[PDB]
Amino acid sequence: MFEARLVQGSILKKVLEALKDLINEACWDISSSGVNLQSMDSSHVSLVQLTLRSEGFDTYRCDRNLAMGVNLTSMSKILKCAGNEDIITLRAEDNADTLALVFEAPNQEKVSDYEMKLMDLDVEQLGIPEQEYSCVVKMPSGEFARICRDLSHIGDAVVISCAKDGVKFSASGELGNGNIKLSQTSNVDKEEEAVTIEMNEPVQLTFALRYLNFFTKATPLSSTVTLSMSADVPLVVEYKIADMGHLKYYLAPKIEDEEGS
Amino acid sequence: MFEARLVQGSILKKVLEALKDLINEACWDISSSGVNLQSMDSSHVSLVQLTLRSEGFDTYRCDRNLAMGVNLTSMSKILKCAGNEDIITLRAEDNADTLALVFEAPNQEKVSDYEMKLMDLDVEQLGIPEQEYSCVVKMPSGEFARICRDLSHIGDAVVISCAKDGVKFSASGELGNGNIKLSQTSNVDKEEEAVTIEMNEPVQLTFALRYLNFFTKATPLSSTVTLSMSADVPLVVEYKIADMGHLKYYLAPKIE
Amino acid sequence: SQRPKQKVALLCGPPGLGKTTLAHVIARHAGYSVVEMNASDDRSPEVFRTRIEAATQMESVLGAGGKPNCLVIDEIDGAPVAAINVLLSILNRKGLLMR
Amino acid sequence: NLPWVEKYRPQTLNDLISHQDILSTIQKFINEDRLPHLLLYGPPGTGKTSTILACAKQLYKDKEFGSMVLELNASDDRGIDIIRGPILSFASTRTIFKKGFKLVILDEADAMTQDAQNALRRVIEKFTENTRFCLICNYLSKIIPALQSRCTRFRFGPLTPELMVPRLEHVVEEEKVDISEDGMKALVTLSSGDMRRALNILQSTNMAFGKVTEETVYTCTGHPLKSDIANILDWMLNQDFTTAYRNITELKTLKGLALHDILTEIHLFVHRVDFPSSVRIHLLTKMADIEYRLSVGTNEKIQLSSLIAAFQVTRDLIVAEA
Amino acid sequence: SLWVDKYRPCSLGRLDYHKEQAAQLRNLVQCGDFPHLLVYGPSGAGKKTRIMCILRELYGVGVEKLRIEHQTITTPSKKKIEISTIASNYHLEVNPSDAGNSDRVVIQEMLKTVAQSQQLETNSQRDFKVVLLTEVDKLTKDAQHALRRTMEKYMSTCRLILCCNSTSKVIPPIRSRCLAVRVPAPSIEDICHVLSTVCKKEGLNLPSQLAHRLAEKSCRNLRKALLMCEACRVQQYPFTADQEIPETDWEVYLRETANAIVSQQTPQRLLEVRGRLYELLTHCIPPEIIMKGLLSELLHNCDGQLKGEVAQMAAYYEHRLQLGSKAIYHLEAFVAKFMALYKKFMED
Amino acid sequence: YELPWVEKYRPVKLNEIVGNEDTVSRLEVFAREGNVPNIIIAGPPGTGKTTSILCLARALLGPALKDAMLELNASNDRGIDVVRNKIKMFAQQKVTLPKGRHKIIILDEADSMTDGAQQALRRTMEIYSKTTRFALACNASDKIIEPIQSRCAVLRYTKLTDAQILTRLMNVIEKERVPYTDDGLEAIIFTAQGDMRQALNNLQSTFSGFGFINSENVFKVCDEPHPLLVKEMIQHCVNANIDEAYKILAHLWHLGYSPEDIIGNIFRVCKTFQMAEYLKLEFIKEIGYTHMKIAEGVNSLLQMAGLLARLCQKTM
């Protein structure tokens, strides 16, 4: 019997708008630790892991594990029914074809019941190993979103290089080149605007910009973004979803042919 | 070696927010007096001349006179990367296949180092002479954007008649007629909101509203616009860009 | 209204004879500044409409008149039918086509 | 429960049979890492998807299968859009986990236009060291020769009955069905070397008639027996036009047989008959004319009497030769 | 004004031939549930006369107030196709075969459009309205499949009257649900009857023998017979039995073509007759019509032991002309085979 | 991670291409001179149009190849906006180039482009010809419009004569020291059919597949109908024998061959068969008619039997 109450309501909306176009069907794996999600794109290039912990919910109780197939377009329309300050209570049965979301006003005046029909999907739980990264860079969310939004105009790819000066985002397209540098910032009045870089070895990898533009719609979830980059390791984009969980992305880098000219 | 540095970055954005829609491509000619742009549209009707002097740039260096052909739609995506208070510096070599634009943040957190490819083009110098205009109107620029966008729906052509009672903008079409009158305003708190009309002879002329709507994208360049019109010379729309340059639109008359 | 009864020319034939060369040198012979057009390059009705009332229906910006322009449309054999419809509606108007 | 075709998809390179050379060459390719792009072509239902899926599951674990294999086919819309969509985006990128080449499995690959084949062959050239394609197709002749000049082509061929019996015996052992000795012979003859039709027709006459004999599967499938074609050809070479025509139209109305199957079984019967050579040339010419004649949508009774007509000319010719 | 269409019948009782089919159609449209019609027969038999007569009997007075509308359609390729429509306030009439390969596009879109159109004051006039598909036989396969889809989905509100000739190329499953009305060509005596009527109205004294000549040279085609009568009136008002009938230029051109064939059996005469065949084909007349004319003017010359093989080769080259795409190769192959067989005939 | 032999043994200079000797020599004259005209190269696949255009562009430009050469291909989108923007502002750009060397737009597979793409192509190649030169590659000139072939110089590449295919094959084989039999190499010629990349891939494929290059190994890794069996089929159809050819037909049908490949190899063997010329014409017409029977959707064994019967009756 899946009852799960969430007081801050628009954070689930921002979680969904991060998954809005990047993925169309996904499976929710439900345990006593909480809500888990692991999916891939239709192109099988980008991996999305979403974890919502048990203690972040207001009243969470769950007797048995639930594998639950979801079309994110249907509840993309259904979570647009939710308000920004509304309380969201999720309810499902052990053998449900149904999903119930109740949207409650903060003054307990407006009550909303919404139903979604579920679909069966085959689940391949791809167990992500714990790997140490050569480079870990934490930077503002709006800054990274602006970085991909400017560099997607020049070309379709970015070359991201982490070295001792800092992090460099490069693009090369038919309009010309583009090279934006970021250095480690010693002193900011707030901890959410600083760029802080931890390193073992300088790395350099190329990434598609459609995927990063899809990734950086998760900007209002967290004020800081952790990019973990290394050689032979995917580009990990960790958003810490407050104290209730984390949203993690995995991008395979592109193939760069080596030319002597 | 050409190197021009500009502190108020957004004015170049205001400058090319309206140039990406009129002319798809443009020539910058560089001399020790400064940087000029005299260009024509594809259909031989509207001319633009933009002058940015060397005094209004804090660092200006022009060793030799240069001609660079810039695609004005390949540059606007190098333009939308700008912040509003960014510092813009432009460099090019004496044998420049490229054009470098370097941005810094107001707090200088990021250093952008864009570099676009130049282009080769047929070059013509069309010397505009010095002539007296029968009617000169100094008018607010935000109102000029408003008047052009409001007779945008009425028709496809405009008729301006400047006479002793003031200036009159008329548009006609299937939805009817839109006629407006602006008079010499006497007492305004600010000089930018005033209208100043200098007249020799009443002048009535006709032009196209699509190009006028293209002209009025330069409303954040200046708070005032000069309209200079006479019997046979084309209509002049003048935006005095800060204290450091001017932008100059010539629109040829329609035929009646 | 002093226009010819044949408003628009429709020279046709096989490739590579010199129709464009003949049209260019005749336009340069008859005191016209040449201006070109590819039709299916910009195949929407609106851009064709803008160029069809911009290349014609206008004076010249240079000096004391200068020289006028005559529109030379190439490759309208493969133009979409809305473009020829816009050209016909601008030809059959009785604000008036002059070039 | 499920039909027997989906329950016994060979999951192991051990379970499958009668494809041992394709097995040996592909495992030799995949152990030493010399596997090129593959183009698997043959008849339907001889196990093209099963061997490549078992090979991809042999290479990778289940916990890394989602990022190293992308499967597409013609159930999705196919053309110039999805070659510039998921396929090269999967092909041009690296692996999210570990290292190694990737796999694109494209089932029924002969259904795309030649523009899409040109886009895909350029995609195959551009990314090769990090992507190994697999195109499964029915007909080789629908594929441009440059694409066949990229990927090595493997012919599965027919499923011979002497290595088609024991898998049917295994599904007989696992699921108890009443099947006689003629059941295996009618299964390996009627399914035409396609084992997907074998396990579908086995379930059809198990659910339909319960017991599996020759008569049950021939009545459920609607195929004519050898005795039926012997009677048909005996009436055509024996009786006059009215009697033979009436006999065959009564038999065809009663048994529900179709003239295309009658034509095929009659053709496979003519070369058993020791006809004279000119008479056999006449018969094969007229019967090929009739089989093209049914393909447009003509009336079946008139072509039936045309077959009887050709056989009446032949019986007059053989008696005139005797 | 021509008398071919001026004295056209309006009511079903003033028909000159096929009175029993007229009474059957009158009692069919007298009651309700008027079904889908497939009218067929030879050219010039009077199918369209029966069709506007059926439209007169089905509706009130306003049945001949017709006008041309023009409707644009869009192919899957981005191209606009303008189609024509003959329409009234009670019915629709479309030729859908003018669009060659985009016939499925118009067959879907145009009848979807007129089906989605609502009959204004539908209680006053009748239950449904009718749609004519004038040239329907040369529509392709999936176009006729969309046609029977259109017949199935709007069976309550829109019934169709398909008019054609030679229904062999018309698909089976549209013939099952359509009532088949077959209009035969009028006989020699009925053609003489209507010629005598159209002459007796206009103050004329046509002899019976010349009416028999007009009927026998009209080849059972009433419009061509009335046009020959009109042209004979223009040529000479005193009508004699020995009158030169003004035959059409393409039939006498085919007669000159045939006598140019039978004159010589050499490749140079084959070049000349190929030029004549090109001149015939350039006038956009159908090559089956040319084939039929060549065989009709050819069988008046050849001997009785050679008509059968000539007729078989005529059917053979007409069929392969239908299978092919360019007519002149099959036509001149037929002419070359006839010349080879005739020179074998007189050579031995 | 070794590279395949199609890309490893690609020529790097213009004299290593054995396709069309006069056209290659004139291309080298234009490479040493500089003023290369607008060219289009047509022919069957594998003749080496791409390597000829690439080697011409390399020998022209040199170090400025990465900025003075735009390669547009079939795997990239080629819509109306692409020829409006990418090709146009490549042709409008400036590159510091020498006196004779010119910008090159390599338009590979130009027959697959739409009509409006070529409509936006034509003006560009006529106007900007002082700077950029178009080197088109294609398979069939019918899908390209006549004006583009008019403004270009058309270079017909022939299907390769088997001798130069042998010379390149000994070059590659001696570069690899791969053992061979002679008749297996002639089988590689027969599997090539004027497709030199197909010959290299089939040799590659076959050696990696099975050691010695012998007829059996190449005919095992290809699995086309065997030339000896189909040649004996056509020979049995020559002397009016339906039955002896039908054992070969049943051998090729119980081996699981599709009818399309059977009739294609029947035509390809009948192309070079030693028989009477008019008889060969009638045979080719009947094989073509049965091939339309196949292509329209009638792929039975009885269509092969009727083909055999018609070939038998046409030989008296």
Ligand SMILES: Nc1ncnc2c1ncn2[C@@H]1O[C@H](COP(=O)(O)OP(=O)(O)OP(O)(O)=S)[C@@H](O)[C@H]1O
């Ligand atoms: N008198 C001339 N002598 C030599 N070359 C000429 C002459 N006149 C024109 N040309 C050239 O030949 C070409 C003339 O053909 P075009 O006018 O460009 O093509 P076109 O005749 O319009 O046919 P299409 O359909 O456009 S390919 C141009 O390249 C001219 O430079």
Ligand SMILES: Nc1ncnc2c1ncn2[C@@H]1O[C@H](COP(=O)(O)OP(=O)(O)OP(O)(O)=S)[C@@H](O)[C@H]1O
């Ligand atoms: N060699 C084989 N050994 C055992 N079972 C086989 C063999 N070949 C086919 N099968 C069975 O046939 C079923 C269908 O196989 P598939 O690989 O899906 O057919 P296919 O070759 O892909 O042909 P398609 O998909 O219709 S083009 C499998 O699930 C197996 O149970």
Ligand SMILES: Nc1ncnc2c1ncn2[C@@H]1O[C@H](COP(=O)(O)OP(=O)(O)OP(O)(O)=S)[C@@H](O)[C@H]1O
């Ligand atoms: N004339 C030749 N001499 C030597 N090698 C050749 C020749 N032609 C082709 N090749 C080889 O075949 C490979 C493929 O040649 P390509 O030029 O790509 O074929 P193509 O002419 O482009 O035909 P397409 O593109 O498949 S239609 C090259 O990489 C060479 O290794």
Ligand SMILES: Nc1ncnc2c1ncn2[C@@H]1O[C@H](COP(=O)(O)OP(=O)(O)O)[C@@H](O)[C@H]1O
């Ligand atoms: N009873 C009749 N009275 C007068 N004219 C008739 C009569 N029946 C038929 N006709 C004439 O015969 C011609 C037949 O033409 P039409 O109806 O178009 O037949 P089809 O559609 O087969 O060509 C018409 O022009 C019509 O004038």
Ligand SMILES: [Mg+2]
């Ligand atoms: Mg032209």
Ligand SMILES: [Mg+2]
């Ligand atoms: Mg399968």
Ligand SMILES: [Mg+2]
């Ligand atoms: Mg190529």
